[PDB]
mmCIF file of C-alpha atoms in Angstrom:
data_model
loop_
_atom_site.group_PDB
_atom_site.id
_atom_site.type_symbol
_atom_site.label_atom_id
_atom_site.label_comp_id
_atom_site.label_asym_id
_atom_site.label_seq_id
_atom_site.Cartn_x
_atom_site.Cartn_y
_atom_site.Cartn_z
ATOM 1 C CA UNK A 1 -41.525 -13.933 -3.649
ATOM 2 C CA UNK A 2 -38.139 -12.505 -3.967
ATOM 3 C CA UNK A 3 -34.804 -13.693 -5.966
ATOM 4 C CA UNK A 4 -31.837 -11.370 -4.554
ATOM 5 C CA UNK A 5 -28.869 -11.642 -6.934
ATOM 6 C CA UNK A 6 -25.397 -9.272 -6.004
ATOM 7 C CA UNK A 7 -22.655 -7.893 -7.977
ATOM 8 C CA UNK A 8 -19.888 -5.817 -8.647
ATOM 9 C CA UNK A 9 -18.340 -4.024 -11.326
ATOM 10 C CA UNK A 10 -14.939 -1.739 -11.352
ATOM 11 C CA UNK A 11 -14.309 1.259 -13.304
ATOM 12 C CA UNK A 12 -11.210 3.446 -13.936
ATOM 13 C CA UNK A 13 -13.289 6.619 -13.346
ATOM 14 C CA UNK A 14 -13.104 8.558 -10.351
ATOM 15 C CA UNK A 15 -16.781 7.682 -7.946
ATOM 16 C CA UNK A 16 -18.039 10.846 -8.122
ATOM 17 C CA UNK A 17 -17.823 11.586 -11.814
ATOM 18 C CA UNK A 18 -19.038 8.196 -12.835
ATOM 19 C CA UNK A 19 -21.934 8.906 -10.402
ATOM 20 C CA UNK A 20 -22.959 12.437 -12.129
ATOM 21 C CA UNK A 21 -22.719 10.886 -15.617
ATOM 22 C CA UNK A 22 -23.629 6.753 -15.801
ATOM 23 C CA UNK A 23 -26.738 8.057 -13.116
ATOM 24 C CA UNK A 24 -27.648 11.342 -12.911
ATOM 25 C CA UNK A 25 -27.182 12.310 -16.483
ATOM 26 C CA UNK A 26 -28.467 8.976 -18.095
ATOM 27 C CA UNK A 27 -31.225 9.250 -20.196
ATOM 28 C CA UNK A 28 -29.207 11.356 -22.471
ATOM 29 C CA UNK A 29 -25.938 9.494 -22.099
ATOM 30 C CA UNK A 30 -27.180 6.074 -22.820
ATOM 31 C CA UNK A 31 -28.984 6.573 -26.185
ATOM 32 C CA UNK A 32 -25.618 8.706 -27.004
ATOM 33 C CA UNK A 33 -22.796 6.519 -25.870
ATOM 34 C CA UNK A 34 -24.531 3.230 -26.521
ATOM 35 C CA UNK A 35 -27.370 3.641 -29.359
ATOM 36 C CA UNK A 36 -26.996 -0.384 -29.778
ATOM 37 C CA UNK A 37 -28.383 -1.254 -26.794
ATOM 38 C CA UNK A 38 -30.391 1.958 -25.569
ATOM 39 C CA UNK A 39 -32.647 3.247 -28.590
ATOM 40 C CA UNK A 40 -34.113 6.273 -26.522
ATOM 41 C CA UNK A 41 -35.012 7.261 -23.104
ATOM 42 C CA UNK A 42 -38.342 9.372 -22.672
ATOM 43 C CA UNK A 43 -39.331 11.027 -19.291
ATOM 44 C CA UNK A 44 -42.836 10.375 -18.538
ATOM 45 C CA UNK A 45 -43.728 11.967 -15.363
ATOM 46 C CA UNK A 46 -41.325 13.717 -12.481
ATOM 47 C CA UNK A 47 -38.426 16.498 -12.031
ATOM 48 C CA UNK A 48 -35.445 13.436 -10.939
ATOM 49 C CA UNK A 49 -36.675 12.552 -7.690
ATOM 50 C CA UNK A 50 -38.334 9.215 -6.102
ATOM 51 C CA UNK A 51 -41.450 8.416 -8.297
ATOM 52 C CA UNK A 52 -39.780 9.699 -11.516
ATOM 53 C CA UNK A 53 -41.151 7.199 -14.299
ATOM 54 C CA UNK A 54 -38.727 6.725 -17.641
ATOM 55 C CA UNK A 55 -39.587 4.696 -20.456
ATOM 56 C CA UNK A 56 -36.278 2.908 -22.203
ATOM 57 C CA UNK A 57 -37.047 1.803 -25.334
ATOM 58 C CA UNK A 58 -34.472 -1.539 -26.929
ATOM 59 C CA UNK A 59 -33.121 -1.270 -30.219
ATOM 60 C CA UNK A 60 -35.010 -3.538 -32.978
ATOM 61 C CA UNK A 61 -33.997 -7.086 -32.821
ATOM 62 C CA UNK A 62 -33.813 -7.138 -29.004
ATOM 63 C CA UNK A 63 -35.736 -9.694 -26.832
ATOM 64 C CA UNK A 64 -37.545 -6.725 -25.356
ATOM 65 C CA UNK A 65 -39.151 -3.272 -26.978
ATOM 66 C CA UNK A 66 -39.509 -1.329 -23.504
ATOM 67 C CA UNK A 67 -38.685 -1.138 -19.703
ATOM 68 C CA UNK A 68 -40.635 1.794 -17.899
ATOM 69 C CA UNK A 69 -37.802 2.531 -14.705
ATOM 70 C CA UNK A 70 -38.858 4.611 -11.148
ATOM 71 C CA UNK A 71 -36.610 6.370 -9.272
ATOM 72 C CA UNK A 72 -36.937 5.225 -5.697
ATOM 73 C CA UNK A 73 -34.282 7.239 -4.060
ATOM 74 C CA UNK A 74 -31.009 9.422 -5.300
ATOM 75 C CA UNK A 75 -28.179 9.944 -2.658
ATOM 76 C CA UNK A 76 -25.860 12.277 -4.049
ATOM 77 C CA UNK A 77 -23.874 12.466 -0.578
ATOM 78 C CA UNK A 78 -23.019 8.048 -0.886
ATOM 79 C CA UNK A 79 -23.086 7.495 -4.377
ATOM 80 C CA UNK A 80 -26.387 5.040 -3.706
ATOM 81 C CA UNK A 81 -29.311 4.711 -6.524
ATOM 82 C CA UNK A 82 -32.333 2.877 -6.362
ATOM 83 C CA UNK A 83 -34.470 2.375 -9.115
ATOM 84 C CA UNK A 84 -37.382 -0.152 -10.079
ATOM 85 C CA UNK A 85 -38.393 -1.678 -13.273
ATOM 86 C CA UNK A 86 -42.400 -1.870 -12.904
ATOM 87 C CA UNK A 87 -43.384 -2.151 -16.524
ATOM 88 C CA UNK A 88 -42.158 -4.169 -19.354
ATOM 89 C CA UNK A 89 -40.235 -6.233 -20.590
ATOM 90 C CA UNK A 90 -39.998 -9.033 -18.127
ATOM 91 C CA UNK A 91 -42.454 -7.512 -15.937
ATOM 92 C CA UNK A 92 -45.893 -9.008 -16.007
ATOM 93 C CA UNK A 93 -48.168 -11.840 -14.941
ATOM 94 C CA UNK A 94 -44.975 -13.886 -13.380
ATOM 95 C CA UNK A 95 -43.199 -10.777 -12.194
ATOM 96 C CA UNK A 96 -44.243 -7.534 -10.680
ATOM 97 C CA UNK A 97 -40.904 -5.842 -10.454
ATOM 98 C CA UNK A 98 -37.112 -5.814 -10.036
ATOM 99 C CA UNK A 99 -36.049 -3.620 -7.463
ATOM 100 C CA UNK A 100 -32.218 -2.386 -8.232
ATOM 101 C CA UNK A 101 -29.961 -0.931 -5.748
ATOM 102 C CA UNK A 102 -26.295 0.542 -7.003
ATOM 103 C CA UNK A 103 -23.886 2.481 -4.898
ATOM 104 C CA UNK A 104 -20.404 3.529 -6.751
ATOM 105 C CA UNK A 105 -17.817 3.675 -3.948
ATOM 106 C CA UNK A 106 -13.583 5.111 -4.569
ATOM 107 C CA UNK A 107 -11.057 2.564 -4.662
ATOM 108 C CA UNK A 108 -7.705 4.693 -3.476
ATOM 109 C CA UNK A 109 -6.228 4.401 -6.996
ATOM 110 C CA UNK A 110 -8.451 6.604 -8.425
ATOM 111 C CA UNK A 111 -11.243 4.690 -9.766
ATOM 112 C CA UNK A 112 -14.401 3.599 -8.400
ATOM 113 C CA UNK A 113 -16.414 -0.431 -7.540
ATOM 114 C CA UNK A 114 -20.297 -0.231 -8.234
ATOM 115 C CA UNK A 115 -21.810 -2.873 -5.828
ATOM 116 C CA UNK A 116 -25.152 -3.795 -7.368
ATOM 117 C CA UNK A 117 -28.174 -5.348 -6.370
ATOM 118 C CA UNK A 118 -30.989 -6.744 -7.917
ATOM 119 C CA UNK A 119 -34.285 -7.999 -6.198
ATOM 120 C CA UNK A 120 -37.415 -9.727 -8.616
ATOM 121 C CA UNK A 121 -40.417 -9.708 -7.139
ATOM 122 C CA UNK A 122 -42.654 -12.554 -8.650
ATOM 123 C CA UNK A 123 -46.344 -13.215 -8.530
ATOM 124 C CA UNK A 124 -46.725 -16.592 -7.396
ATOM 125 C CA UNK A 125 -43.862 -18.829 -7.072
ATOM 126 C CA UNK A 126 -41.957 -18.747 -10.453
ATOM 127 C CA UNK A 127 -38.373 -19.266 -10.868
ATOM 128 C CA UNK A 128 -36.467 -16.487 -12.301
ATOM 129 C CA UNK A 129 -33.657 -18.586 -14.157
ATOM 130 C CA UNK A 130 -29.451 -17.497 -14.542
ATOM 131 C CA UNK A 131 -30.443 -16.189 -18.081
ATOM 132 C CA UNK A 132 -32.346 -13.023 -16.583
ATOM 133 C CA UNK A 133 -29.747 -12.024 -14.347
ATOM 134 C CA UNK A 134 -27.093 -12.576 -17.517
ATOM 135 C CA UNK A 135 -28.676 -10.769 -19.561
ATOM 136 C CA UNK A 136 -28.578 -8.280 -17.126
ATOM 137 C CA UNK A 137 -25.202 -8.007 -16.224
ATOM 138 C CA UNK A 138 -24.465 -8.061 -19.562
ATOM 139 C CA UNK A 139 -26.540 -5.404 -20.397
ATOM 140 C CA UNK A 140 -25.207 -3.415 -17.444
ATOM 141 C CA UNK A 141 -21.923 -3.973 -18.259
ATOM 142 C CA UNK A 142 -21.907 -2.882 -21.855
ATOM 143 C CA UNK A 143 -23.704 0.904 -20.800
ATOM 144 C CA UNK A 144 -20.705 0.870 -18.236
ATOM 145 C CA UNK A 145 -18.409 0.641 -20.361
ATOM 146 C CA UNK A 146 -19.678 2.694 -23.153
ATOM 147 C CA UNK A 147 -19.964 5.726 -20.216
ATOM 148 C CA UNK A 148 -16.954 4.961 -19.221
ATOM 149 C CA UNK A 149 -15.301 4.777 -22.951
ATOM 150 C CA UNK A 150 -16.982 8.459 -23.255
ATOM 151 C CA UNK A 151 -15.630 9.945 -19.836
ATOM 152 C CA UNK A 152 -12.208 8.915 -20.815
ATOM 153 C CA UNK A 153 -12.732 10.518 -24.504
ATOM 154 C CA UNK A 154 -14.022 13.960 -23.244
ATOM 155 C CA UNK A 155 -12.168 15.094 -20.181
ATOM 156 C CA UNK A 156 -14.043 18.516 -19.493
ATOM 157 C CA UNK A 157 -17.892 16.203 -19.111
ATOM 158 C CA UNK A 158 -19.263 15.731 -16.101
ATOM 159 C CA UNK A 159 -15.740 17.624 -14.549
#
């Protein structure tokens, strides 16, 4: 079955920049800006498009060594990502995926809301759960900020 879970987070960068670097330029910002949470991010198959397959690998200590990610769909035009965890750390014989939907949208002062959405797909009937979804927030947050920390630091990235 499914679990649906919303969000939002707010950032001080502009939509469009935060767009370019937090998704379109992630597997090299994350293990840069946040090495204690992100160890590495290896491409496994696909140019950046729907299908692309990443593996993110956890630092040591974590509760998790891996997440492999697909890119389901990129709009560049709406700010909107898709993405799906399919292998991995949660993901097994209680839970086939977590779909993820995230579209970064301009608030008039100049920075930007990220409406997020998360969807776990179970096999069977089997609760997912408020610790999950914290530690993914939290998790979320803490990249966000990090990208955000290094936008703000280095004004001509991602410009």
């Amino acid at each position: 079955g499914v679990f649906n879970y919303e969000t939002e987070a707010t950032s001080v960068i502009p939509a469009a920049r935060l767009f370019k670097a937090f998704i379109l330029d992630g597997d090299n910002l994350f293990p840069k800006v946040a090495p204690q949470a992100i160890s590495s991010v290896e491409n496994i198959e696909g140019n950046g498009g729907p299908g692309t397959i990443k593996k993110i690998s956890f630092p040591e200590g974590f509760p998790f060594k891996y997440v492999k990610d697909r890119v389901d769909e990129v709009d560049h035009t709406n700010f909107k990502y898709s993405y799906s965890v399919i292998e991995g750390g949660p993901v097994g014989d209680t839970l086939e995926k977590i779909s993820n939907e995230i579209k970064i949208v301009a608030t008039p002062n100049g920075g930007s809301i990220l409406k997020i959405n998360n969807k776990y797909h179970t096999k069977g009937d089997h609760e997912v759960k408020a610790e999950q979804i914290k530690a993914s927030k939290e998790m979320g947050e803490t990249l966000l900020r990090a990208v955000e920390s290094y936008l703000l630091a280095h004004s001509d990235a991602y410009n």
